[PDB]
Design a protein around this ligand. Structure first.
Ligand code: 90E
Length: 290
């Protein structure tokens, strides 16, 4: 897969600002000889596994060509430190973006973000790629408000995400984003990604609220097994809440496919008055005045 990738010479790459970090490398904003890029490094002393996982992310990204999937510019593999270079998403991770922009977008803009995410996910699913870690923290946002799916690879995806925790039976999983069958018996498919997408829908419509609030991981699993689901966000179109609820069907076969999700979101956006009908919000506070 690396043969598809452009090998970039180090002298074309200028790292400027540190935007992400880890123990074995950092992510930078930089310039590529005259365009802005993001640059992820892998420090010397890396293991064979680290090299295979690191370059494997670029290999996977290089197989994709879609508006809603992060674009690979190239790799530096013949010099050290090794680097992966992608387009630069000016607004960063979607979860933090929404929390910093609380209430600043229209309902139509929020639904448009979800349509872009769904289109990227439909592409991945049809390319036989199961994400396993779909969440707003793994979506990136550009200066056109376009949302693109990121975080690709094999074992590195769940291993590197601190939201993914060790379960009781083994399996490092981000519990509150993960479908029941993936938690219970390790069955990760595009239909478990659809469950996760429903959680992403709730994250977007709430401007980055943490799913299930302070419930512990076990409390979340128990609640889901007992039939409870996340309540409607504030100011949420009825059609949007209905859609996220169908993503959370216990029976995998009853969930919409991403093809269905993209179609529904596209129809709602193209007839935007449909989004004015709101699901009832259950208030958690009563304010009474004479
Ligand atoms: C360079 C690269 C290699 C392999 C995979 C990927 Cl997806 C990438 N590209 C990126 O990480 C990025 C592309 N554009 C980015 N823009 C950006 C700008 C400002 C802040 C953030 C941001 O929230 N970045 C996340 C925060 C969590 N840690 C990883 C991070 F990238 F730093 C992102 S990061």
């Amino acid at each position: 897969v690396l043969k598809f990738t452009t090998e970039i010479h180090p002298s074309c790459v200028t790292r400027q600002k540190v935007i992400g970090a880890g123990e074995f490398g950092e992510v930078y904003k930089g310039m590529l000889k005259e365009v802005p890029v993001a640059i992820k490094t892998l420090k010397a002393g890396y293991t064979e596994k680290q090299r295979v996982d690191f370059l494997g992310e670029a290999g996977i990204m290089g197989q994709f060509s879609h508006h809603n999937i992060i674009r690979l510019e190239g790799v530096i593999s013949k010099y050290k430190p090794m680097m992966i270079i992608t387009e630069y998403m000016e607004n960063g991770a979607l979860d933090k973006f929404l929390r910093e922009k609380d209430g600043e977008f229209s309902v139509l803009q929020l639904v448009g973000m979800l349509r872009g995410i769904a289109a990227g996910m439909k592409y991945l699913a049809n390319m036989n790629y199961v994400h396993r870690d779909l969440a707003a923290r793994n979506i990136l946002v550009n200066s056109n408000l376009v949302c693109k799916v990121s975080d690709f690879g094999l074992s590195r995806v769940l291993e590197d995400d601190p939201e993914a925790t060790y379960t009781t039976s083994g399996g490092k999983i981000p519990i509150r984003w993960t479908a029941p069958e993936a938690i219970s018996y390790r069955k990760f498919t595009s239909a478990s990604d659809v469950w996760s997408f429903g959680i992403v829908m709730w994250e977007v419509m709430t401007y980055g609220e943490r799913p299930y609030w302070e419930l512990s991981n076990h409390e979340v699993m128990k609640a889901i097994n007992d039939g409870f689901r996340l309540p409607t966000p504030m100011d949420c179109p009825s059609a949007i809440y209905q859609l996220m609820m169908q993503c959370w069907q216990q029976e995998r076969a009853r969930r919409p496919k991403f093809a269905d999700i993209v179609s529904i979101l596209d129809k709602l956006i193209r007839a935007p008055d449909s989004l004015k009908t709101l699901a009832d919000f259950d208030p958690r506070v009563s304010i009474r005045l004479p």
